Write a protein that binds this ligand. Sequence first.
Ligand SMILES: Cc1cc2nc3c(=O)[nH]c(=O)nc-3n(C[C@H](O)[C@H](O)[C@H](O)COP(=O)(O)OP(=O)(O)OC[C@H]3O[C@@H](n4cnc5c(N)ncnc54)[C@H](O)[C@@H]3O)c2cc1C
Ligand SMILES: C=C(O[C@H]1[C@H](O)[C@@H](CO)O[C@H](OP(=O)(O)OP(=O)(O)OC[C@H]2O[C@@H](n3ccc(=O)[nH]c3=O)[C@H](O)[C@@H]2O)[C@@H]1NC(C)=O)C(=O)O
Length: 340
Amino acid sequence: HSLKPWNTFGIDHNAQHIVCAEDEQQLLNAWQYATAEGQPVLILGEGSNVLFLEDYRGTVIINRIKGIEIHDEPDAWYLHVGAGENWHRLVKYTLQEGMPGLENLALIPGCVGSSPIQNIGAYGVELQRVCAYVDSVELATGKQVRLTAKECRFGYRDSIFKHEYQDRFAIVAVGLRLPKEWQPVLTYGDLTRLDPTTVTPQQVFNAVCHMRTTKLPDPKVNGNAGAFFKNPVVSAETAKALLSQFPTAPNYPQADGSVKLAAGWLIDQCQLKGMQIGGAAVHRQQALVLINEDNAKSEDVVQLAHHVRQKVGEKFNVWLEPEVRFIGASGEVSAVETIS
Ligand SMILES: Cc1cc2nc3c(=O)[nH]c(=O)nc-3n(C[C@H](O)[C@H](O)[C@H](O)COP(=O)(O)OP(=O)(O)OC[C@H]3O[C@@H](n4cnc5c(N)ncnc54)[C@H](O)[C@@H]3O)c2cc1C
Ligand SMILES: C=C(O[C@H]1[C@H](O)[C@@H](CO)O[C@H](OP(=O)(O)OP(=O)(O)OC[C@H]2O[C@@H](n3ccc(=O)[nH]c3=O)[C@H](O)[C@@H]2O)[C@@H]1NC(C)=O)C(=O)O
């Protein structure tokens, strides 16, 4: 009954049934069975990006469809990875096997199947860079479907799976394309200290993990769902006004003039690091992460997020949007709405 083991935040709520699908038929069957009994279905990888708000009235299917195949192309390696594959383990594997290209995405929690959903990205790379396609099963018809990376409509923490294809499809495999001619991505932060000519894939991996281990909490210590909020993109005008009043604010100008701000900085500037509500707190090494400090209840997390958002809104007139998927009793609910 308990969802606690299934979400990295460690939120304790119940689901009517929790089922581990080792293969597609199992997943599809679990889905058919649950929906036939009129209940909603939720597919999870490692539950590292979800916040259960209350007991879930349906079935939660843990996607454990594993296996990896490697197709050889002159120019690149094509990986067809089961949705249930652990992402970080895949990264180490590819590096181990001499197929670099995933190093900047090292240590990001979750299953490979969930990687396209919010276009996992860090240290200058997003999954859209290496994603060839995504294969899913249309739950209603058992119709397997493939979407090219372009058809996935990848965006900043966004993809078609958060829209048109949410619920209708269960991702069962992800196709990655890793160029045989490796080109390191050293544009982000401390990676700029590395030399393109000398650096090896493992060296990037270590640099990336070093920054990650110093800033981000390990869920096995304190449950968390990573960055709780998306870095907001504001109008050039809002960005101008804000930077004039807060010059040192980290910002990332978009091609169209809008500017992305670092939500973590904004939260931090509100002296929020360490703030806690109930068993939940703002992580002190990366203010963007809300953690399960001491048997946090979901309401503690919701209230804390509300507080953080309000404070940042009142100081900078920038309104943060959660990056974590809020799961209500019958399915996903609006996160912003929940924390408003
Ligand atoms: C410590 C920590 C650090 C993080 N760092 C980063 C980072 O640097 N960059 C980044 O981009 N993200 C980061 N995240 C977020 C997280 O790693 C991603 O959102 C990841 O893709 C979630 O994988 P998951 O398998 O745990 O998905 P889950 O949390 O299990 O599910 C996420 C959502 O996708 C759905 N879904 C999950 N699997 C499937 C499937 N097979 N078919 C259909 N829907 C599915 C779920 O129903 C839900 O809506 C971090 C999280 C944590 C805890
Ligand atoms: C952890 C996640 O993703 C992470 C990802 O690992 C890192 C690195 O690429 O970039 C995002 O954080 P981020 O924008 O805060 O990256 P950071 O480099 O840590 O910091 C950006 C700026 O904010 C500042 N910053 C950040 C947090 C803080 O508490 N204080 C602060 O001042 C930094 O010093 C920096 O100058 C992700 N988030 C989003 C929401 O886009 C996640 O999605 O769960």
